[PDB]
């Protein structure tokens, strides 16, 4: 018969990152998670308690609760044609702080500083990111860079 257990198909998901087995390093336990902090879920196979279900491996959510050894994480799960709010109680060994917003926070501080320096120096802000633009015109010299002519090579086997 068919088999869909709690940890079904997790054989490689919950492995220990070859030559990184054994005890969990202490920075994982020294991390501090506040309510509202954004965390990525990655189950540690060596910690069987507070383990997330395989569906939440690689999912990123928001902490809503803080307990002795665990945090509550809010995950929006796609069920049918809509998203349902799921609340996971995960031990800190299965989560890490998400860097999906460190760049945003640093951009926020940089934008604030740039806006202040703009309203102190003149009128120019340009605080929006822009996509990679087409390259402008450039002049390419041949000094020491005379073009070398290539040709397609004839077929051969060399086996």
């Amino acid at each position: 018969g068919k088999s869909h257990g709690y940890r079904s198909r997790t054989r490689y998901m919950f492995q220990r990152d070859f030559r990184k087995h054994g005890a969990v390093h202490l920075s994982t336990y020294l991390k501090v998670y506040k309510v509202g902090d954004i965390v990525d879920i990655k189950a540690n196979g060596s910690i069987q308690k507070g383990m997330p279900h395989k569906f939440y491996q690689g999912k990123t959510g928001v902490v809503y609760n803080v307990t002795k050894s665990s945090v509550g994480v809010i995950i929006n799960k796609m069920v049918g044609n809509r998203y349902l709010e799921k609340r996971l109680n995960l031990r800190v060994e299965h989560i890490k702080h998400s860097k999906c917003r460190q760049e945003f926070l640093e951009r926020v501080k940089a934008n604030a500083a740039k806006r202040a320096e703009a309203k102190a120096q003149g009128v120019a802000v340009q605080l929006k990111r822009q996509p990679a633009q087409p390259r402008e015109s450039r002049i390419v010299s041949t000094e020491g860079n005379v073009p070398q002519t290539l040709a397609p090579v004839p077929y051969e086997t060399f086996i």
Partner: protein, 296 residues
């Protein structure tokens, strides 16, 4: 060389090294995790360990908190500072451990401004008690005892340091069944024996037995006591005066540090081999190869 030394390439490739301080045989990470891991719902509260380590000739008593960058010492006390308080011999014994625990407790309370409150056990009698919280006041500074890899035995100097730190006004949770004087056949401690160990009564009794017995051993051991004209009966008042002086001035006067760090560094740099550069390595390889002009 041997058919089991010089392990194979596959074994070396697949070998996962333990944590460095586990390879060094110094840190028990299973215990350290439980000592250090804080209740997540405090979000900053450091968990302070009273780390007690016994090397030869010295006792280390530290109060340490943990950070991601590494451990941070709040206050440190050593048994080689006991000469400042009148203990110049037996710097690793039970009484030295008790004195060091008292010194670290008093120094930490002074650093945190909690020395006047929580005076601790000023009249030590060997009675089991914890530093109680005062009513309508700040709670006592709480530290958790860190033996390290030393074994939990009834009578250990690590628990002597624990007793001294508890008597010094720090709140160190502990039971009394590991103190010298606990009777394993029942569920009570011997306060007189505990006080005797606090004030060196076992060492004084050994001194008396060795003096009343073969004098060669009492002349080899305790030789410094004889050369300092210290009697066995004087140890109790020596340790009492040491406790009084520790409580009087636990302010950590440091050494004057002659031979400033720069000349210390130069002197140590004289006696150190330097890594050969890649050019030197290639030169040595070429010399070794050219040595075989023919074949040796």
């Amino acid at each position: 060389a041997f058919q089991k030394d010089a392990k194979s390439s596959a074994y070396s490739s697949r070998f996962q090294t333990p944590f460095r301080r586990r390879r060094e045989g110094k840190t028990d990470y299973y215990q350290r995790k439980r000592l250090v891991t804080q209740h997540k719902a405090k979000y900053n509260t450091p968990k302070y360990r009273l780390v007690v380590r016994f090397t030869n000739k010295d006792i280390i008593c530290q109060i340490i908190s943990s950070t991601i960058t590494g451990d941070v010492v709040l206050a440190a006390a050593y048994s080689h500072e006991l000469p400042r308080y009148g203990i110049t011999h037996g710097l690793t014994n039970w009484a030295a451990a008790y004195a060091t625990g008292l010194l670290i407790a008093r120094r930490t309370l002074q650093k945190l401004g909690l020395d006047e409150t929580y005076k601790g056990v000023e009249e030590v009698e060997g009675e089991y008690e914890l530093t109680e919280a005062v009513e309508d006041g700040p709670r006592p500074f709480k530290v958790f005892l860190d033996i390290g890899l030393q074994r939990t035995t009834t009578g250990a100097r690590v628990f002597g340091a624990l007793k001294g730190a508890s008597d010094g006004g720090l709140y160190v949770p502990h039971s009394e069944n590991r103190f010298p004087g606990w009777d394993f056949e029942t569920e009570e401690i011997d306060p007189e024996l505990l006080r005797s160990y606090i004030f060196g009564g076992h060492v004084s009794q050994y001194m008396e037995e060795l003096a009343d017995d073969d004098e060669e051993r009492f002349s080899e051991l305790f030789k410094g006591y004889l050369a300092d004209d210290i009697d066995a009966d004087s140890l109790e008042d020596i340790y009492t005066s040491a406790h009084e002086a520790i409580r009087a001035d636990p302010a950590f006067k440091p050494t004057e540090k002659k031979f400033t760090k720069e000349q210390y560094a130069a002197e140590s740099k004289k006696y150190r081999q330097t890594k050969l550069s890649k050019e030197e390595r290639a030169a040595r390889v070429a010399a070794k190869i050219a040595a075989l002009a023919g074949q040796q």
